[PDB]
């Protein structure tokens, strides 16, 4: 559910702010059924944190499976950071090729016209229709890769609900395999000859793969301190507000 937000916000800013489409449909499909699955399947192999044969039976009328405390995390805090990281890699790709963030607002109507072969950028260059479309597609590829990068820290902060990572431990071999495969698939979809004709994903330059790293580290640090106040302060605000 965390991956949702960074999948809808691009279109919302598209219709309201009038900017070129940040996340394509064949890329959402690649994340929705590619990257997410193996890790989500691996999250089942997680061992207990505390003694499970010691707690009382769950109340059916109060402790549900999906409460508002979860929605506040996935839809509210983690997904938001992931969406911001994606919009960062996007603006970087368009600024390095010629379209600065001030000239993108108000361009969609002429960016999508199939009969305007002269679109001026922030520096004065004239771009044909197919040329600007290639850049938009490369922005979709990097957006998808940014999603995978932030999903790394999301799969690690989702591994444990309360306990710390330095306590439980990364003894789950399936999760490790999930991260490795999740990265190999993105690189494969972006560098195999014939993807720009079949799936529309262009190769990325090596400096762009590092635009999502800080957001991931931040997600990890935020969730770590979150899981810390719950332990030291039982029954406090962080527990009745963020404890799934």
Partner 1 sequence: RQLFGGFSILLWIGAILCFLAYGIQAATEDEPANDNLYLGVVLSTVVIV
Partner 2 sequence: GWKKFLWDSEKKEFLGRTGSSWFKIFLFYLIFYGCLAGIFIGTIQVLLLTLSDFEPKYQDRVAPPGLSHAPYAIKTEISFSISNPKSYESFVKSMHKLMDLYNESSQAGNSPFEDCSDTPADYIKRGDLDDSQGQKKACRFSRMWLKNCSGLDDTTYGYAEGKPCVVAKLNRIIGFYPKPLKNTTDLPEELQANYNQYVLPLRCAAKREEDREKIGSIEYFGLGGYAGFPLQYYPYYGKRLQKKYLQPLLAIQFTNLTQNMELRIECKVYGENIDYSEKDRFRGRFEVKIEVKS
Partner 3 sequence: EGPDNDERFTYDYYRLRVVGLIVAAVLCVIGIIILLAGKC
Ligand X SMILES: CCCCCCCC/C=C\CCCCCCCC(=O)OC[C@H](COP(=O)(O)OCC[N+](C)(C)C)OC(=O)CCCCCCC/C=C\CCCCCCCC
Ligand Y SMILES: C=C(/C=C\C[C@@H](O)[C@@H](O)[C@H](O)C/C=C/C=C\[C@@H](O)C[C@@H]1O[C@H](C[C@@H](O)[C@H](O)C[C@H]2O[C@H]([C@H](O)[C@H](O)CC[C@H](O)/C=C/[C@H](C)[C@@H](O)C[C@]3(O)O[C@H](C[C@@H](O)CCCCCCC[C@@]45C[C@@H](C)C[C@@](C)(O4)[C@@H](C[C@@H](C)CCCCC[C@@H](O)[C@H](O)[C@H](O)[C@@H](O)[C@H](O)[C@H]4O[C@H](C[C@H](O)[C@H](O)/C(C)=C/[C@H](O)C[C@@H](C)[C@H](O)C(=O)N/C=C/C(=O)NCCCO)[C@H](O)[C@@H](O)[C@@H]4O)O5)[C@H](O)[C@@H](O)[C@H]3O)C[C@@H](O)[C@@H]2O)[C@@H](O)[C@H](O)[C@H]1O)CC[C@H](O)[C@@H](O)[C@H](O)[C@H](C)C[C@H]1O[C@H](/C=C\[C@@H](O)[C@H](O)C[C@@H]2C[C@@H]3C[C@H](O2)[C@@H](CC[C@H]2O[C@H](CN)C[C@H]2O)O3)[C@@H](O)[C@H](O)[C@H]1O
List residues near partner 1 by CB under 8 A.
Answer: 25-26, 29, 33
Q: Which residues are annotated as a binding site for Mg(2+)?
A: 3, 7, 32
Q: Judged by CB under 8 A, does residue 41 bind partner 3?
A: no
CA dihedral 41, 48, 153, 43 (to 10 degrees): 0
Compute the least distance from the CB of residue 201 to partner 1, in Å. 14
Distance (Å, whole) CA 131 – CA 154: 35
- Is residue 108 within 8 A of residue 14, CB to CB? The reply is yes
Task: Say whether residue 176 binds partner 3 (CB under 8 A).
Answer: yes
Q: Where are the beta strands (DSSP E) in 80-233?
A: 119-120, 126-127
Residue from 188, 228, 237, 244 in contact with partner 3 (CB under 8 A): 188
Beta bridge partners of 127: 119
120 near partner 2, rule: CB under 8 A: yes
Please report whether residue 198 would count as binding ligand X according to CB under 6 A.
yes
Q: 166 contacts which partner out of partner 2, partner 3, ligand X, none, CB within 5 to 8 A by kind?
A: ligand X
Instruction: Give residues 46-85 in contact with partner 2 (rule: CB under 8 A).
Output: 76-77, 80-81, 84
Q: Phi and psi (nearest 5°) for 127?
A: -110, 125
Rounded to a whole number of angstroms, the minimum distance from the CB of residue 193 to ligand Y is: 27
Q: Is there binding between residue 127 and partner 2 (CB under 8 A)?
A: yes
Which residues, 6 or more positions from 89, have their beta carbon under 8 angstroms from its beta carbon? Answer: 139, 142, 143, 145, 146, 208, 211, 212
To the nearest whole angstrom, how small is the minimum distance from the Cβ of residue 186 to partner 3?
8
CA distance 114 to 110: 9
DSSP string, 217-229: HHHHHHHHHHHHH
Residues that bind ligand X (CB under 6 A): 26, 29-30, 33-34, 81, 84, 152-153, 156, 165-166, 169-171, 176, 179-180, 183-185, 188, 192-194, 197-198, 213, 215-218, 220-222, 225-226, 229, 236-238, 240
């Amino acid at each position: 559910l965390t991956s949702n937000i960074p999948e809808i916000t691009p279109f919302l800013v598209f219709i309201i702010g009038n900017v070129p489409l940040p996340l394509g449909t064949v890329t959402i499909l690649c994340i929705d059924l590619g990257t997410d699955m193996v890790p989500a399947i691996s999250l089942a192999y997680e061992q207990a944190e505390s003694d499970i044969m010691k707690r009382q039976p769950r109340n059916p009328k109060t402790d549900k499976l999906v409460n508002e405390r979860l929605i506040s995390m996935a839809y509210g805090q983690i997904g938001m950071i992931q969406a911001l990281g994606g919009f960062f890699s996007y603006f970087v790709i368009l600024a390095e090729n010629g379209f600065l963030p001030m000239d993108l607002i108000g361009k969609r109507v002429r960016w999508d016209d199939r009969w305007i072969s002269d679109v001026e950028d922030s520096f004065g260059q004239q771009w044909t229709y197919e040329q600007r479309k290639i850049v938009e597609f490369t922005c979709h590829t990097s957006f998808f890769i940014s999603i995978v990068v932030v999903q790394w820290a999301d799969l690690i902060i989702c591994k444990t609900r309360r306990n710390s990572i330095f306590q439980q431990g990364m003894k789950n071999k399936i999760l490790i395999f999930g991260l490795f495969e999740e990265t190999a698939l993105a690189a494969f979809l972006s560098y195999c000859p014939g993807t720009d004709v079949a799936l529309r994903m262009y190769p990325l330059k090596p400096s762009w793969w590092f635009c999502a790293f800080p957001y991931s580290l931040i997600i990890f640090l935020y969730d770590e301190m979150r899981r810390f106040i719950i332990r030291r302060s039982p029954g406090g605000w962080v527990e009745q507000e963020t404890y799934y």
